[model samples]
Target: QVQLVESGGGVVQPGRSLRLSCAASGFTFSSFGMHWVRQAPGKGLEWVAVISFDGSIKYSVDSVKGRFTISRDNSKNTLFLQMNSLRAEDTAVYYCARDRLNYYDSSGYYHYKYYGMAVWGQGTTVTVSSASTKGPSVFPLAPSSGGTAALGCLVKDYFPEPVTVSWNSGALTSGVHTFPAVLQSSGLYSLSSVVTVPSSSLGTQTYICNVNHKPSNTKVDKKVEPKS
Candidate 1:
């Protein structure tokens, strides 16, 4: 019942920074290490980077160790790969996968065994093009129910596909849902995200939708207060 989806790809300019995201669900994200892999057209798969379950371990290929970063949000169960100083040679289809490990001390040599990548993302293509870029515009919608049981957010006109949406600064994810990006008429994209609130905090809670559009380094926040 585990799943991961790769996103945040498309044309990026050389020397620019890009953040690729892998949203995971159906499992505890912080319980396993996450790895990043990349492949060009004719080149086979190559290891890019990895971040351990508790963020205690991090490793990357020597060539990219200084330019790549592996991080995650345990609450959202999402893994992120941010690479800077992009170049034409960096263009590739990137994938994120999960890894489980077991540590042991034997024969006076300490080592660990990996279970291999059990779950993986479908992969997302990133192109280095110095053309242009645009970030998503976000707005908050009223709760779906009469008493503010649920709230929604609308994102539109983003040049690149796949942006991350966080609820209350990533404080809630159990009832949150993000829809797939929809291609707009102008070649841009749009998407919607919704989150539900429990009855206990309905009357006195203010939910904030944190939209992170990393391509342009833009972040938009919309606040929704439950109306009594």
Candidate 2:
């Protein structure tokens, strides 16, 4: 499974404010969530808040409780952290954890029990920097009624090095294929992913691709369709 990454960075200054994001993939996002965890320099772990792909959030009871707000955008599998009245002490490396709720089945019924941030995004130093984004152009290889046709999505010109491309792998009739990011002379990035259709057996279908620049809390999406 592909892992998660934190885009919650950029030289956020003291007394200033900024937003952080967590992009989740390698699994069905709606089935899980992510926790915003941070580590003070030479310090132990700190729990800031936890957010689900479904738009629910739980926060830390620390000072951050009143100064921060957490949210998520299902359209892009990204969790948002809005921080206000930032202080230099807030400078730390932040991460996104797989916030999975644990439950037990009782007498043929399921019960909500507890949860934790199991998978961690490791470390992405939240320093200071930023940028904008671009297209997700779609192209159809060939449309054949004989159960064979392919399509692709191109994500071009996005500032910052790391971004995520997410989509439903199983729903893909053929399969989802990815191409790594290629750095351009402009210091931006571009990449593409393609999928082949198994067959339009069920009639008209919709295919989508999502892009998220986490450190800056940005997301974009595009769809592939048959041209009339």
Candidate 3:
């Protein structure tokens, strides 16, 4: 089995550079490539880039090209991803994976491409705690039901502050809503919410939950409907 090990610092200042490393063992380096994925604190995952073993190629999907580089040292069986111009939003867990190539059917044509990650490194956590905390929370509870049915929202982590929750129907009601916070595990957070609507509203109603935070907010939505 292939395994990846990663290491990086805990904090970085804005406009500075951060260097992270992912070393692979028990796999032939020439057969696969390495990929970098980033997840901001309390945020969703994002694909950063990929690099081949020989350091002959590199690719990035976002606005990270100028700030990121992927390289490998064949003698040590290690791969590295370097990032510069670091910002608070860039603080997150970085993961490295081995790219597995496969074939898939696309538009009725069989096309060959890199399929997915076969091995993932133990993620490295980096925080930008010095930045302002004005972004929205990452988790939310949204529930919807028809008639007398009740739909429940289950949140994984609950904070001390009250969350906001909301309900709506049709196209105009879609937006972010937070809910009350609930305690969970020790020193962690979680919460839940429920929304009930008439049978007539089941087909058209939606509920949303949100937590306010900086730069950007996190949100989740659920639609209500009856089983046919």
Candidate 4:
């Protein structure tokens, strides 16, 4: 019956701050330690901070050393996270976990280890955007040629949308098609572009996708050489 329910997820401008709350149930809040972890959109989990059972000792990762604070309120049976100076990269789903305080170390320090974070909050997603422009990341997909050659490109994680995608080869010029940028839950934009050309020309021609994001002054060219 142990449960951790998290709240306080919203979109915030970069350089702003956010506070999250995790309510504990079916257990004594003061007897169990707590920790915070986060995962970026489509990325792996990362440890953020940990607070002792009595809220006396705390540890945090260097990435958020100065900006992330952890605390607990026994009266409310809630754990709190104070995150300040948000950046676009800080957009993530934050979860709070109950830890089991295990053995003491050689330094005479009590540590929270093992037990594998069996209980965690439902997670609060915080999106950071708008304080500054962020450039697009371009990824190229190799061209596949048979009866037709298809060249693909992916543009992602860009702020303020409005990106342009074009092709360098004349054969691909009219065949190029760029999809509308989709705004992700992470407060960024993503899009895909493709160029289709006759397979006969694939052996001798190279198709290059050009992505432009004006706000961030980003221009990327991803070239694909289709094998005969």
Ranking of predictions according to TM-score: 4, 1, 3, 2
| Per-prediction TM-score | 0.53, 0.48, 0.51, 0.56
Q: 64-140, model 2: which lDDT tens digit per residue?
A: 87887888776787777888877756767887777554222111133222355667886666543233343333333
Where is model 4 more than 4 Å wrong at Cα? 101-115, 131-228
Candidate scoring better on lDDT of 2 and 4: 4
Q: Which residue segments of model 2 deviate by more than 4 Å?
A: 101-113, 127-228
Q: Of 3 and 4, which scores higher on TM-score?
A: 4
Comparing candidate 1 with candidate 3, which one achieves the higher lDDT?
1
lDDT of 3 by residue, 1-228 (tens): 668899964554578777888877887765566789988867898998877645666778667878878888877878788878877677789998887641221111332235677788889986543333222234323333323545554555433233454444223332322345653444335555555444465566544433232223544454433434
Clashing pairs in 4: none
Find the candidate with the highest lDDT and give its number. Answer: 4
Q: How many clashes (backbone N, Cα, C below 3 Å) per candidate?
A: 0, 8, 19, 0
Model number with the top TM-score: 4
Model 1 weakest lDDT span, ten residues long: 102-111
Error of 1 at 174 (Å): 49
lDDT of 1 by residue, 21-117 (tens): 9998877777788899999856999989877676666788988878888988888888999989888778889999887442221111332235678
